[PDB]
Amino acid sequence: MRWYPWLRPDFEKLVASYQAGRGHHALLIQALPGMGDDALIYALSRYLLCQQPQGHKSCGHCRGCQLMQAGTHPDYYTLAPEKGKNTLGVDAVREVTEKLNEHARLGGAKVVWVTDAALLTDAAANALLKTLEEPPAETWFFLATREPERLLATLRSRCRLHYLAPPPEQYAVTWLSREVTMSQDALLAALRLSAGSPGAALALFQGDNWQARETLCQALAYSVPSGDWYSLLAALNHEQAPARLHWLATLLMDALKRVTNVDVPGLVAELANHLSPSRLQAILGDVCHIREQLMSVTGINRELLITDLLLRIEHYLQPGVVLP
Amino acid sequence: MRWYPWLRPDFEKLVASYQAGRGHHALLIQALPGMGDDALIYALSRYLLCQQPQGHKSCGHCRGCQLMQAGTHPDYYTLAPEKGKNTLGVDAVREVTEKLNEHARLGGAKVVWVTDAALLTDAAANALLKTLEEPPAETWFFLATREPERLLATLRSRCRLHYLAPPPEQYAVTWLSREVTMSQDALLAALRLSAGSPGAALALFQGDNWQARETLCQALAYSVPSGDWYSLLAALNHEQAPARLHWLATLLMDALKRVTNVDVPGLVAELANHLSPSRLQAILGDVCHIREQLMSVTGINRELLITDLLLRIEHYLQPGVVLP
Ligand SMILES: [Zn+2]
Ligand SMILES: [Zn+2]
Hints:
homodimer, Zinc Finger, Delta Prime, domain 3, nucleotidyltransferase (chains A, B), DNA replication (chains A, B), DNA clamp loader activity (chains A, B), transferase (chains A, B)
């Protein structure tokens, strides 16, 4: 968790509303990963659970802050998928909502943080909704998501959406330049690959990721002129395949614009030069569809999905083939 | 970690010294567990690594604070026994000291926190010493211990000792009364058992501990009149035997005062009534000696140590036995 400098505008805007009573019991924060919704929700949680706030800040001394620092505040709740699963069950939710019906142990506010409302199960989201439609006194809910479209529809309409928008690109590049030492086109590229999220753009430079993209890039440099796309399996067959497929989709889409990958105009050119627009699009549609298949229910056998993808792509390159 | 209210006096005293340049590069903090030396050392670490301190506080916005919040500051070091061991090896130390010889990544201060200087190995402490005798520029070390007597002697003389003294008993009882709901003699007892450490006194009320003492207490109520001391094995044979032996020692010592266990004057009386002072002392000396044996090198077979202890005790109760 980190307090990024672009969070202030949003923080002061939301915090003031809770302070002046214009706060919603259900705040749905929309944000890309690495934008700091977690730090924002925490700073707001800390403010509300501060028994003696100093302006918009938590004091860091009162007992409430002491129990928060310790991680033992009885009135603060966290709903995250049990480390054993990848979704959020109904028992966990109800278990927290049931307790939300008792008078707050420290006699003040109660705060509930749903880490990713998308992971909620259909019965869990349905149970949360019931609580949201009849909010227990002095309870403040914070639900965060990357894509609110992936949420139980009825849940979305009971929350006030606050979109945590990325800061200006130029500001983000500079921030990044301070976190790592790289050519600025690579930074801007990482940033565009991340949809403007500076934290996620920084995660790419930390470890496996940046090198993985180069390997992919090197692998594409061979597949394009050779027509051998199945050879890409190594660079894509890995846990983080969904992100790796995004990179790919991103290059194809750049090749179709006669720009996200500003650091590799060479390969974008090679793609736009050797592949017809009809094929760049057919390949792009397929890549995006498999990307989703891998994220919706990572087909128990991911390598099959990908190999078939690479073979459909090679089928596309053939003269006389109908592209659909 | 928790910012206890009794820490302020010490915090402001130390922080002011670093601010006015009267700070020692090697601060050895002496404190009982649960006194908050960890929170104190952290607040001081945070102050020194704040690139834009506001008085004595860290700002919580500058990049240094951001990396600390994230737990990624390259100039902050932590030396704790690797989770796989119960001591602190030489490789870990040197590994940090070697890096302490490079110019600080963020160009400011460097902070090293030795969690428990007692756990240092003889070669590790000896290596730390070498660094302490020739402190690298702008580096601040914080070593904490429960008993400075258990440290490499040469290490102790290169550090400024700051004893984090427990707050007044009356203040500690009241603080505790706010953390738990118990009869105040039990609080004061827990507190005295903890040597005045309010955090450690609170840990006794959290789980296994308080019930474990009652079980021990109930077990003593039977052993005293029956002379059957081996029957205490169940109540004492457990991971936390050293603390459990302390409780015992504490009751014997109270029985010898013709008061730490203020909540159970009944059992203290029964002890002082049925056991002669010569035996209370012989039993007390043995208990304390086994306690240490269990903490110095928890005799691979702890249950043997304890059973022999209980049998020596029964031997003591016999008419005509020389007590030594
Ligand atoms: Zn507070
Ligand atoms: Zn700062």
